Amino acid sequence: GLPPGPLENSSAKLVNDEAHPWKPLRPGDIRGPCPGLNTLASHGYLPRNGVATPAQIINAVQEGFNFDNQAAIFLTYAAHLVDGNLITDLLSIGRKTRLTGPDPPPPASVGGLNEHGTFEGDASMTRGDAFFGNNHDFNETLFEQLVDYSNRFGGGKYNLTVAGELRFKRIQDSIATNPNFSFVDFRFFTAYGETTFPANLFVDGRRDDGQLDMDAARSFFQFSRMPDDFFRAPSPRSGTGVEVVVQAHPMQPGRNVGKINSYTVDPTSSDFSTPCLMYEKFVNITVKSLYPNPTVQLRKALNTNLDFLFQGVAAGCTQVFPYGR
Numbered sequence: 001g002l003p004p005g006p007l008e009n010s011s012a013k014l015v016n017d018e019a020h021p022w023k024p025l026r027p028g029d030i031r032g033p034c035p036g037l038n039t040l041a042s043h044g045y046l047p048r049n050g051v052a053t054p055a056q057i058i059n060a061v062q063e064g065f066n067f068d069n070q071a072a073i074f075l076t077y078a079a080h081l082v083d084g085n086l087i088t089d090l091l092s093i094g095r096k097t098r099l100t101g102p103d104p105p106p107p108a109s110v111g112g113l114n115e116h117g118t119f120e121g122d123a124s125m126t127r128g129d130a131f132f133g134n135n136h137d138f139n140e141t142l143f144e145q146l147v148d149y150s151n152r153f154g155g156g157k158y159n160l161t162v163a164g165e166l167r168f169k170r171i172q173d174s175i176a177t178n179p180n181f182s183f184v185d186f187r188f189f190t191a192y193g194e195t196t197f198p199a200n201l202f203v204d205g206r207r208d209d210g211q212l213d214m215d216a217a218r219s220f221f222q223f224s225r226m227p228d229d230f231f232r233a234p235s236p237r238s239g240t241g242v243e244v245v246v247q248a249h250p251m252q253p254g255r256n257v258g259k260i261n262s263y264t265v266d267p268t269s270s271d272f273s274t275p276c277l278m279y280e281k282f283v284n285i286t287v288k289s290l291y292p293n294p295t296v297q298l299r300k301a302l303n304t305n306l307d308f309l310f311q312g313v314a315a316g317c318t319q320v321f322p323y324g325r
């Protein structure tokens with residue numbers, strides 16, 4: 001389907017409404033590492049079983065949270081290219097499932113958003129690193145660390161100052177304990193953006209003060225549930241304030257080299273000084289390695305979704321064409 005456009009009416013409004021009640025999971029319902037998508041599925045902005053089309057995801061993040069269009073397009077098509085089924089146009093927001101349809105040939109995995117190292121990655125705030133056995137479920141110990149950092153740096157609330165401190169701690173925790181810790185290219189960028197999302201989109205839009213209370217935080221992160229009478233943000237936004245998080249503790253992209261406490265900077269990795277390189281490497285290396293020699297129908301689907309991905313890329317970058325034009 002074509003990427004949806006921006007909201008016609010982007011005002012704050014009740015999104016926990018009669019048409020979108022929270023419901024508990026049924027057997028087979030899929031939830032994954034993203035509390036935003038999880039909450040939209042659990043309120044029926046997305047299909048409640050957690051399998052959706054890219055267009056459904058873009059409409060849901062806009063309607064439910066006032067996520068901005070360009071950010072919605074970039075993240076959705078990036079996720080779908082590496083984790084979704086390009087022939088059926090379906091993506092799981094969590095585990096791999098037969099519900100995304102017949103699989104493409106190896107080495108493509110169509111693993112859902114749970115797939116480690118495609119979109120999902122290390123030093124998540126409330127989810128453990130994949131090396132420790134579970135990269136998708138809410139983790140109470142990690143959430144209690146978020147509450148502690150909110151008490152120490154946010155007066156009890158999560159805000160961008162807390163984000164800056166927590167983001168760093170999680171990186172340092174992974175360096176100290178995960179011998180396979182990877183923090184380069186796509187993950188490097190998205191990890192920082194994700195820490196702003198609670199302060200920008202989980203805060204009731206009638207306040208929009210960037211101060212997230214811990215009751216609301218737990219509701220979204222653990223139960224995929226909007227607070228009672230939750231109003232969405234009063235304007236489209238995504239990662240505004242990521243500059244504050246980075247400035248708190250500037251880091252170079254890099255990885256542990258098979259041992260703990262061996263963080264080695266990767267000079268081939270993109271960083272905030274090279275955002276177009278991040279896009280080019282995602283397409284020429286990540287997507288191309290999953291689909292090195294696609295058949296006619298897969299090539300067409302890839303090129304279509306790569307065009308859609310480029311719509312979400314900030315002005316100034318050149319489109320790359322791994323399968324030609």
Ligand code: HEM
Nearest residue numbers: 033034036061072075079120121124125126127194197201
């Ligand atoms: C637009 C499409 C979206 C996609 C494809 C997407 C995908 C993902 C994925 C795969 C992760 C896991 C990364 C990781 O931590 O390892 C993630 C994390 C996250 N997402 Fe989303 N997301 C989207 C939109 C949103 C929205 C609209 C919100 C908030 C309203 C949101 C909030 C978050 C948060 C807070 C995390 C971090 C969880 C943590 O570190 O504990 N996302 N997202």
Ligand SMILES: CCCCCCCCCCCCCC(=O)O
Nearest residue numbers: 071074189190193238239313314
């Ligand atoms: C992709 C970095 C995450 C930062 C959080 C804000 C979301 C913006 C989505 C990306 C839009 C432009 C991406 C690009 O120019 O490569």
Ligand SMILES: *[C@@H]1O[C@H](CO)[C@@H](O)[C@H](O)[C@H]1NC(C)=O
Nearest residue numbers: 008009010011012013014234
């Ligand atoms: C836009 O939405 C607001 C509340 O969310 C509502 O008051 C207003 O009537 C709407 N405008 C249009 C275009 O219907």
Ligand SMILES: *[C@@H]1O[C@H](CO)[C@@H](O)[C@H](O)[C@H]1NC(C)=O
Nearest residue numbers: 116117129130131132180182
């Ligand atoms: C280890 O890191 C590599 C990339 O460096 C990744 O492909 C692999 O899935 C990682 N394994 C775990 C469980 O972290």
Ligand SMILES: *[C@@H]1O[C@H](CO)[C@@H](O)[C@H](O)[C@H]1NC(C)=O
Nearest residue numbers: 127128132134139140141142
């Ligand atoms: C949660 O994270 C903690 C701290 O990293 C870890 O020790 C624990 O094994 C994880 N899982 C659960 C189920 O608590």
Ligand SMILES: *[C@@H]1O[C@H](CO)[C@@H](O)[C@H](O)[C@H]1NC(C)=O
Nearest residue numbers: 153154155159160161162210
């Ligand atoms: C976070 O809240 C605390 C206490 O109110 C404050 O010290 C800090 O400056 C706040 N940060 C932001 C971004 O408002």
Ligand SMILES: *[C@@H]1O[C@H](CO)[C@@H](O)[C@H](O)[C@H]1NC(C)=O
Nearest residue numbers: 277280281284320321322323
């Ligand atoms: C991506 O591939 C295109 C050719 O399709 C090339 O022009 C560009 O330099 C490549 N970028 C990277 C980072 O490899």
Ligand SMILES: [Cl-]
Nearest residue numbers: 006068069236
């Ligand atoms: Cl928008």
Ligand SMILES: [Mg+2]
Nearest residue numbers: 120121122124
């Ligand atoms: Mg993760």
